[PDB]
Amino acid sequence: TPWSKSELVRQLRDLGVRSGDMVMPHVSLRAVGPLADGPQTLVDALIEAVGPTGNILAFVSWRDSPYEQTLGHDAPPAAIAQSWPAFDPDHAPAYPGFGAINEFIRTYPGCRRSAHPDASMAAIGPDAAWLVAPHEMGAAYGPRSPIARFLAHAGKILSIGAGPDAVTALHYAEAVARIEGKRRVTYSMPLLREGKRVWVTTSDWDSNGILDEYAAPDGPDAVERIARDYLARTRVAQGPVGGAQSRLIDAADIVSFGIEWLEARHAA
Ligand SMILES: [Mg+2]
Ligand SMILES: [Mg+2]
Structure with a gap:
């Protein structure tokens, strides 16, 4: 039977989602299963x-x-x-x-x-x-970004059948970690400025690997390794949403863990 809205809502509350929460979701739809309305x-x-x-x-x-x-x-x-x-x-x-x-x-x-x-x-x-x-x-993904304000706003990361590599907020830990060898990338984006296209070129932290050892295209990157270690070390509510194994994570806590994880492993 396709999952109903009200069934999903009960599972979310069972997991710990409360009225008033600030949630960032990462979802595997095939893990959830057929929904009543997609x-x-x-x-x-x-x-x-x-x-x-x-x-x-x-x-x-x-x-x-x-x-x-x-x-x-x-x-x-x-x-x-x-x-x-x-x-x-x-x-x-x-x-x-x-x-x-x-x-x-x-x-x-x-x-x-x-x-x-x-x-x-x-x-x-x-x-x-x-x-x-x-x-x-x-x-x-670092200071001044929406991820930064999410972390200041009691943010919870809701992983619904997603893997440990999925946790975008940990790119904030990569951005502020005091570690040598941090990889950066240069790219260009076309923005709308007053309805005209304007090309803007910028550098930022490499979000496909903050260090060479994490930049193998198949992984594991540092986000995966941090999140995998965090979930083995922390009490986190776990339960079903639809057919999917789901977790509800304290975003500030996992990011602080990730900052410490990187700084422990790489000289300053
Ligand atoms: Mg508010
Ligand atoms: Mg719209």
């Missing part, structure tokens, strides 16, 4: 679980980010520069690789969307505008 049912369930004073923050990115196409160049290659669409937060679809739920989140009425095309975040709830801005180039 993925919207789970989006509906999450909005109901956090209530009208609660907030959802999701890492949605952009289906057509020109990250790899501009990676490593001090300007976008001519053919990219001429024809790439400017990022338009009202119409740019979500990146499919983080899960099909994120397109449903970002098109929810009243959803706000942050201005960073590659790191774009969507937020639903009364604090959404405060969560999504500022989001400037060169500050994808």
Whole structure:
């Protein structure tokens, strides 16, 4: 039987989601199983679980980010520069690789969307505008980003059948860790400024491996290794949401753990 909205809501409360919470979800839809109305049912369930004073923050990115196409160049290659669409937060679809739920989140009425095309975040709830801005180039996941404000806002990470590599907030630990050898990347994004396309080139921390030993394309990256160690070392509520093994994680706690984890292992 397809999972109903009200069944999902009871499971979320069993897991510890309370009215008023600030939740960032990472979802494996195939793990959850058939829903009564497809993925919207789970989006509906999450909005109901956090209530009208609660907030959802999701890492949605952009289906057509020109990250790899501009990676490593001090300007976008001519053919990219001429024809790439400017990022338009009202119409740019979500990146499919983080899960099909994120397109449903970002098109929810009243959803706000942050201005960073590659790191774009969507937020639903009364604090959404405060969560999504500022989001400037060169500050994808660290201080001054939506992840930073989420960590200051009692944020909980809701992993619904997702792996330990999925925890976006740990890129904040990578950004502030006092470790030698931190990898950076250079890329370019096309922004809308007054409705004209403007190409902006920036550097930021490499989010595909903060150090060489974590940059193997198959992993494990540092996010996976930190989260795997954290979950073996911490009491975290675990339970089903739909058919999926799910956990509800204290975001500030896992990020503080990750900062200490990196600084213990790598000289300053
Ligand atoms: Mg909209
Ligand atoms: Mg509030």
